[PDB]
Design a protein around this ligand. Structure first.
Ligand SMILES: Nc1ccn([C@@H]2O[C@H](COP(=O)(O)OP(=O)(O)OP(=O)(O)O)[C@@H](O)[C@H]2O)c(=O)n1
Ligand SMILES: Nc1ccn([C@@H]2O[C@H](COP(=O)(O)OP(=O)(O)OP(=O)(O)O)[C@@H](O)[C@H]2O)c(=O)n1
Ligand SMILES: Nc1ccn([C@@H]2O[C@H](COP(=O)(O)OP(=O)(O)OP(=O)(O)O)[C@@H](O)[C@H]2O)c(=O)n1
Ligand SMILES: Nc1ccn([C@@H]2O[C@H](COP(=O)(O)OP(=O)(O)OP(=O)(O)O)[C@@H](O)[C@H]2O)c(=O)n1
Ligand SMILES: Nc1ccn([C@@H]2O[C@H](COP(=O)(O)OP(=O)(O)OP(=O)(O)O)[C@@H](O)[C@H]2O)c(=O)n1
Ligand SMILES: Nc1ccn([C@@H]2O[C@H](COP(=O)(O)OP(=O)(O)OP(=O)(O)O)[C@@H](O)[C@H]2O)c(=O)n1
Ligand SMILES: [Mg+2]
Ligand SMILES: [Mg+2]
Ligand SMILES: [Mg+2]
Ligand SMILES: [Mg+2]
Ligand SMILES: [Mg+2]
Ligand SMILES: [Mg+2]
Lengths: 556, 556, 556
């Protein structure tokens, strides 16, 4: 088992995740099995506490784990399926060790950070690196990405663990890549290597020695800066890799392959890649990165979102839209519309922003209501679903656009003008959405539907069955708690709201599709968790093909 | 509230505990209320897992907590009663924070070491420093002793916490004392200040600045070494305190008062001691420290102990014996006798060590069987209790010498030759000791008798009632699980084994005293937890007064 | 004597010189006597070895010292006269100590870096801080600017010296200001305080504690960044000073006075400024900084310079031009014309750049030939002087434009077509410029005319006498070696080349002024060494007033 550790230098927002993912993509293209581990030095255990407006985009693995979005980035770039243990945190390690000590399996000894916490870290890393992530074959390389910057208090147990680890796994199996900031004060316009010198000094002091240096700057750095860095950091000048700000993120593995990273890793980790097939063709990645700078025709999509700030709060959604638009060969223009600026309460307060938001929503080609874990701004979501329903505008709803869609449908098409949720307003005669928790053996009470579940379609006349390649079932990822009530599902089925897919027991409803409309569908699950750069997801594919009037042509 | 933080320098075994305790003793003598906090950077939560041969001498507070022996040292030197929270560890802090995060009282934020763990440490320290330890009056100074050496990974959260803390409590209320090693290579016989320079550099880097430097050497250091240290560490030359190896530990507060520490603390922390009464007489401490170097007549006591190694494995016991001997005005010579080297199995293996151990046990004036948390070597304890019973040699048993004494009494005086425990050999018709756990409301099951409990004596003719000042009750500290069976307690009461004291409900037995013997008593509790330098404990007092034939004279 | 030390943080080009000069300007305006010391950690002793294309603009003090240009910046901003010892370097200190040791005035002891080099540094600093720089009154504050970044090997003796020094001069007389880089990666657009945290940690470790933090960013930083910095660096949030990129350098003292630096220094150094007169009016500095952003009408000046690169290679010249243009109330547009691109050798090689350079020289309003210490490109200087002479374009020559002007005058007006220098081509019958070195008692041989010398004018009809306020003499600064030959000075005086000023002995010639021309003058000295922001120098004043046809109007 070979390891590649990716550490960070001067500051935090220095670009470690894209470097690690690109390493993975290169090695994958060369024919290797690659897993990856992300280490977060914060005290949390999961993302089930994280507020959406505070961190954004809980990513859900197919075993039901709510983890960092960085594991989502690895899943997209490497095309693998990671588990909950592929994400180590400080809280997880300290909890495992404190519990082990409290049930007396250290045999009365004093448990200390060194060596017990570092032994725990090393055993965890060695353990989850042999777990298969692509089928059943063992991985051959593991990319470990360490969060934070060297010198911080929070990351010291981990660098101590990895010093000992580099000697435990026989250094010919261990490579370290250091990502640092080469700043450039515009008072003189010269790249400064002094912060990199300091950070590599701290790294050497802690016991680790870099094999690659990845510099982060805005344009390329010359050979003099490269030679100064290789002199102070003890690498070769070819092992100093410059990654400037490129067009897209899909150009970073190509820029890494242009700097000859594959040959250095093939000799340093003693892999035995046969460097003959075009040097392990990254051919379709080249096609995709070329399309990213070629598309011209625009498609405008609206995103009715509560936390309009985009500190990665709709990351998987935006990326599913991008992967869909690139395969449709069109440029994506994304509009973010606050959902609370759509209710006429703002009209009562000040009509200016109300009107401009409504005009931005009106001049769009398609609508996407994402799933906010909450009820704040749901009124705007109902208004937007209604507007799109009575204007023949294509719409896709995600885990809450289903609830909002069925609510507005009942309200303004079946006369149940008091239909609402039990999310809020739990005092309602017409509870259109109810709470049907999961009851699996091993539960006392009930919890969400979490993870990969099977879904079976109903009948013939539906487009979602076509976009999915006409299969009988489809496995997707669920993170919901509330459903719709079957009384009403057969009430509002005579009126135009067909239910196309649901579980094997037919007790819940997952995909609605109101007929007599170009594209009006909704899903309880999240389709943006299985969207990859080289294979988009069929719901977003259809939403893009409909918003530019290419859907029917694509069906045939 | 004023604080004094005591940190450590070059190595670990540098003498921090005695420095902190002596600070406390000085300030106490000057008329102040002093509490103290001990910080252990290890991952454990309590000492209930610690093996006795691994750390030695679990100390039991009077609320039932099993803590470090350093809290025992503070209790002896300061004459206070500390609680479980006066002993912070890394495990306690990380467990409190992980639990707070897992029940969502950080409100969805990311919990990080800085600032959340350091905020937790600061709030804990501020909290337990206002808890009264002497009656009900609030403390005025708090001595915080930080374990480990500056620069270690385990102690970084704590020094970060205390940097922020020094600014939160208004520096005129915060003083730091740094204890360092001044080594002396005998190749040249000159004290070296260079390691102190390095450690104070690391301390300054982490954000703290010393107010006192306490050097640790074998003989005094001159004024040139003192001036070099004050030059590199930014203190005055009078704030460099030399503590060499003295006669006893009772000379350290006197040596601190000779270096004018009280005046510096009175001006630096702005206490308002009225330095007139002999400068706050340490008079009876002077008497005790003088007696330590004056006593001449010897008394030899045997300690039948399993783990003959004395890495502080019988600390409170040995110190109770010392406090008893000093008030009796005699020198104490302590013999450690392995309990497993008394059973004739070693006689079968090799009789040499068997015979020499038995001769050491035979030429002693008194026997003390301590309480080992286990059953290893109990056979030797039975043999020793029997030998002392049939030779009129004074004996005191502690929490297991009671069980061993009653076992040998039954065996070799009432014919129940198969009497044993349920500790080991749970298959016995004659279970002399049984398991009567505590059942207090708030329990599901049963746990030990732990902490301070009341004890009432039975009748008139007993010496233990006399040594205790003839009170009706006495509060002591229990850490036992097994008792004796009442059937047998009234069986072997006609034969000479009187039961003098027990609980209020008379369902257990605590003090046995077999009459027709100079001094043969036993106790279920531990009397060595309430033994102080200036007031010994009556059981050990009587054991010393009997082993030198001064008991009857002392009674009158 | 009060001290202010200015140190540097993360990188080198962080802006220390302007911060130190602005401190000086503020304190000067408040009515204090201020001196300043610059510490360069390089091994050189003077700038007499520095190549002009390598460092640029040797500045000449009025005692004959060739020093850094930073002393020129202090002289301009503070309006003082510094000496050679106001510029400490590593070479100076180590040479003084090595020589002291080699002549046995350490009395046989071992001389070590600590304490002997640091004692030398401290005595030097204490010594030159009491030397008067403005008349004869003792200074009251001293600004010490330490070059380089904390953590470098070259600057460790100096920070050790200043730790000891802060305690030697009684901390109430010592203040430290730390200038650091707050970088801003545009991937997220958030200012990062982590490098400042690291550098202040190193600074604290070395023994110094900041009193002010001066952050360097492109736009202002908020109160959250300010609070994070004050938390980690132990200052108040008002002592965190943000200096963004402003219009000019004359806005930095005003931005410092807006952040209340004067009040903090008045309380911290216990100066006794009476903060009543507008809080010590920086009134004419306000006028000048306002004019910097108000001037509209343009004036274009050409600079025929060898090393067209401007790494501060014509700093004093460009600044004299700016100070002149601002008082004339016009905007200055400066053109840099390579002197070697004017000889027709480039015409033979490629005429494109030749022609474009000649067109840039042709479309200018005035010409300035600066003094290059050499002979490279002098041919272009002769061509430019000739072009300006036969086109009635105003010209000013500086220490080599005098030689070039007299050479072209002889050549193309008196028929001596082989007139040249002994600088190059030492084989010439018509040596128009000769070498007349200085012979002062205390010399074996000859050296340059270096430092402040007196100059007496000749007669009535001249404009340079008018621009100087019609004085009899003027003290200027000389750094030349070659002069003109008196035979020829009376040869080409009938032809239109009048000599207006020279020494007291009339053996050399300093100011030529060819009549029958708007403004054609030349000077052997450098007038750009006495040019101040609030009083320009008369030669450049006249050159600007002539290039915009305002000279004659200004004369009356
Ligand atoms: N394979 C990846 C990796 C990165 N990202 C996105 O690109 C942005 C920048 O990535 P990253 O390198 O992780 O930036 P930072 O997290 O700010 O830098 P660091 O990890 O060093 O803290 C992130 O929002 C991430 O969602 C992505 O699209 N796909
Ligand atoms: N470990 C080091 C490295 C360099 N220097 C000093 O730093 C100075 C160079 O300044 P700087 O430009 O900041 O260093 P660079 O190596 O050039 O780094 P940068 O890329 O930021 O320019 C030199 O005088 C050198 O003596 C030092 O003292 N200690
Ligand atoms: N008030 C005190 C403090 C110390 N001791 C005893 O003296 C010995 C040495 O004390 P200490 O200073 O704590 O030594 P170390 O623990 O080895 O040093 P450190 O705390 O720095 O690790 C210990 O066994 C302790 O039991 C004591 O009798 N009474
Ligand atoms: N921060 C310091 C302190 C001292 N020195 C050097 O260390 C040498 C002194 O050696 P040493 O005896 O080890 O230092 P001392 O201060 O005397 O420490 P010690 O008490 O161990 O003798 C001197 O040459 C001095 O230049 C140094 O380089 N850096
Ligand atoms: N009072 C001053 C100070 C600075 N300068 C000029 O402004 C430029 C930047 O000044 P400085 O702060 O010294 O920049 P650096 O030298 O690059 O930064 P540092 O001193 O920290 O190395 C320099 O070219 C200098 O000539 C100026 O005009 N007048
Ligand atoms: N001395 C310190 C300071 C901070 N942290 C950790 O650093 C993380 C914060 O990351 P970063 O953003 O890089 O630190 P900031 O203080 O916010 O610095 P910056 O201004 O660059 O954002 C937190 O988890 C905190 O636990 C640490 O380990 N050691
Ligand atoms: Mg990242
Ligand atoms: Mg440099
Ligand atoms: Mg100790
Ligand atoms: Mg020495
Ligand atoms: Mg500078
Ligand atoms: Mg941050």
């Amino acid at each position: 088992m070979k390891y590649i550790l990716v550490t960070g230098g001067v500051i935090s927002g220095v670009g470690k995740g894209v470097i690690a993912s690109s390493f993975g993509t290169l090695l994958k293209s060369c024919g290797l099995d690659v897993t990856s581990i992300k280490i977060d030095p914060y005290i949390n255990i999961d993302a089930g506490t994280f507020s959406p407006y505070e961190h954004g985009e809980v990513y859900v693995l197919d075993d039901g784990a709510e983890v960092d979005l960085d594991l989502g980035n690895y899943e997209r770039f490497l095309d693998v399926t990671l588990h909950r243990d592929n994400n180590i945190t400080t809280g997880k390690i300290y909890k495992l060790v404190i519990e082990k000590e409290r049930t007396g399996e250290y045999l009365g000894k004093t448990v200390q950070v060194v060596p017990h916490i570092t032994d725990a870290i090393q055993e965890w890393v060695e353990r989850v690196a042999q777990t298969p992530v692509q089928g059943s074959s063992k991985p051959q390389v593991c990319i470990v990405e360490l969060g934070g910057t060297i010198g911080d208090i929070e990351g010291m147990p981990f660098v101590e663990a990895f010093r000992q680890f580099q000697f435990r796994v026989k250094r010919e199996n261990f490579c370290l890549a250091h990502v640092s900031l080469v700043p450039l004060p515009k008072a003189t316009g010269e790249p400064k290597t002094k912060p990199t010198q300091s950070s590599v000094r701290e790294l050497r002091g802690c016991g680790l020695s870099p094999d690659l240096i990845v510099c982060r700057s805005e344009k390329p750095i010359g050979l003099e800066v490269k030679e100064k860095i290789s002199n102070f950091c003890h690498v070769g000048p070819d092992q100093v890799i410059c990654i400037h700000d490129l067009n897209s993120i899909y150009h970073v593995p190509l820029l890494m392959e242009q700097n000859g990273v594959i040959e250095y890793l093939n000799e340093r980790l003693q892999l035995n890649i046969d460097m003959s097939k075009r040097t392990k063709c990254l051919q379709q990645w080249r096609d995709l990165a070329r399309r990213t700078e070629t598309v011209r025709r625009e498609v405008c999509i609206a995103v009715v979102g509560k936390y309009t700030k985009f500190t990665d709060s709709y990351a998987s959604v935006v990326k599913a839209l991008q992967h869909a638009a690139l395969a449709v060969n069109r440029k994506l223009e994304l509009v973010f519309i606050e959902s609370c600026l759509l209710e006429e309460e703002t009209l009562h307060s000040e009509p200016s922003k109300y009107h401009k938001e409504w005009q931005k929503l009106c001049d769009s080609h398609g609508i996407l209501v994402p799933g906010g874990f909450g009820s704040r701004g749901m009124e705007g979501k109902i208004r937007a679903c209604q507007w799109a329903r009575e204007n023949q505008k294509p719409l896709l709803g995600i885990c809450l656009g289903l609830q909002a869609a069925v609510i507005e449908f009942a309200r303004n098409k079946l006369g149940l003008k008091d239909a609402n949720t039990t999310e809020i307003d739990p005092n309602t005669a017409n509870a259109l959405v109810i709470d049907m928790p999961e009851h699996h053996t091993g539960q006392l009470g009930g919890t969400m539907r979490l993870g990969k579940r099977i879904t079976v379609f109903s009948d013939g006349p539906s487009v979602i069955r076509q976009l999915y390649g006409n299969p009988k079932s489809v496995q997707e990822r669920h993170r919901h708690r509330y459903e719709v009530n079957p009384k009403y599902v057969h009430l509002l089925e005579e009126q135009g709201m067909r239910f196309v897919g649901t579980d094997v027991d037919k007790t819940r409803m997952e995909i609605i599709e109101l007929s007599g409309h170009p594209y009006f569908v909704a899903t309880q699950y999240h389709p943006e968790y299985l969207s990859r750069p080289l294979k988009p997801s069929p719901p977003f594919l259809g939403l893009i093909l409909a918003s530019v009037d290419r859907l029917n042509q694509y069906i045939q």
